């Protein structure tokens, strides 16, 4: 299983399935990590921060204080910055957020109506919608979309530096570039929006400023890339299966549909942990110091939990999929992302546009965060 091989990138799920069917916890000797594809095993590891951590300092790896961030901190340090970010999120009025997200989606769909040629939904919809969405939520002016995507893409590709080490350095430069962007916003941002709220919250709580800046960069980059890649994958499915949008289109029906779309097309393919204390996982004894890569997109296709796992089924139990993670590090923006995809579905139905394939979905060589390079369609 070469995660960056073109045939794997074209469609990794059959390879995930072959892995899962042979062993839910495989040792990958060249990557020096456990590969976890079973739902039960991924759910176990995500929720157990006592024996599996995200802060490599807990296995005696040197991490400078200037690089600490909400994603790479474990209790008790994680709680302070986590609560700070959640408090800032909860201060945002949802009526305004939903109005902004709905208008952004409608505007970009309207620009596509009347296009007689082939249009790429990645560059023309998924990315620009995601960029304006996250910056509206943050309360900051959107940067140039093409330029921001270029810097952001370097960070995405750096998530695979364990496979291709040359990807690490461009990612570090890009992280520094986005950090200066966040630093400018912290200094100048209006009181309206998430940045203003996080700034207010930080004054009270006491968080290292470096953690706050690094954590705000995570909110920006996670918000942009996760939403962008989710929208692309969902659109890829809808263009091939337009019947998915021909359903009842009630609040409750779309709840089930959105849940299935996130389960199937959630872009996070891999979510890593380090073992802090020996613990059985699947058939294996995982040892302190071991790395585990949780293939959560594979876990969302485990047939023991999701029968007919590759299909949208509107009658599944809610709250099962792992596309937002689980436990202490569960996605801060899970509610924003579901609200956003809901509005996208609603804008598509009100737009009355039919989106037929004008060529194959083409996938970028990124293994940790799945993303389309191009999604060519005709608009009628």
């Amino acid at each position: 299983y070469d995660p960056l091989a073109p045939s794997v990138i074209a469609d990794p799920y059959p390879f995930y399935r072959k892995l899962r069917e042979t062993n839910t916890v495989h040792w990958h000797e060249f990557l020096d990590s456990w590969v976890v594809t079973g739902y039960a095993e991924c759910r176990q590891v995500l929720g157990d921060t006592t024996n599996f951590g995200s802060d490599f300092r807990r296995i005696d790896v040197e991490i400078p204080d200037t690089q600490l961030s909400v994603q790479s901190l474990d209790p008790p340090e994680h709680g302070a910055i986590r609560h700070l970010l959640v408090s800032a999120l909860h201060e945002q009025p949802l009526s305004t957020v939903r109005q902004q997200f709905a208008a952004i989606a409608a505007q970009h769909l309207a620009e596509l109506s009347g296009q007689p040629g082939t249009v790429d939904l990645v560059s023309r919809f998924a990315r620009p919608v995601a960029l304006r969405t996250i910056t509206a939520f943050l309360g900051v002016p959107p940067p140039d979309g093409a330029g921001f995507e270029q810097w952001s893409n370097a960070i995405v590709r750096s998530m695979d530096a364990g496979i291709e080490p040359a990807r690490a350095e461009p990612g570090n430069q890009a992280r520094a570039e986005l950090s200066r962007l966040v630093t400018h916003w912290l200094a100048e941002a209006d009181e309206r929006g998430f940045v203003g709220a996080a700034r207010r919250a930080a004054r009270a709580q006491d968080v290292p400023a470096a953690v706050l800046a690094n954590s705000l960069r995570a909110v920006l980059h996670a918000g942009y890339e996760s939403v962008s890649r989710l929208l692309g994958g969902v659109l890829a499915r809808l263009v091939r299966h337009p019947e998915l949008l021909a359903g009842p289109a009630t609040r409750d029906a779309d709840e089930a549909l959105v849940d299935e779309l996130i389960r199937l097309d959630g872009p996070v393919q891999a979510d890593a942990r380090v073992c802090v204390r020996d613990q059985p996982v699947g058939a294996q004894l995982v040892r302190r110091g071991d790395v585990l890569v949780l293939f959560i997109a594979a876990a969302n296709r485990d047939p023991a939990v999701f029968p007919d796992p590759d299909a949208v089924r509107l009658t599944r139990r809610r709250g099962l999929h792992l596309a937002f993670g689980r436990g202490a590090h569960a996605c801060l923006g899970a509610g924003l992302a579901t609200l956003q995809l809901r509005e996208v579905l609603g804008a598509l139905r009100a737009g009355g546009l039919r989106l037929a394939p004008a060529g194959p979905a083409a996938y970028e060589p990124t293994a940790t965060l799945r993303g389309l390079a191009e999604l060519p369609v005709s608009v009628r």
Binding site: P3, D160, T368
Partner: peptide, 5 residues
């Protein structure tokens, strides 16, 4: 492979 922004 690490989902780290």
């Amino acid at each position: 492979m690490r989902y780290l922004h």
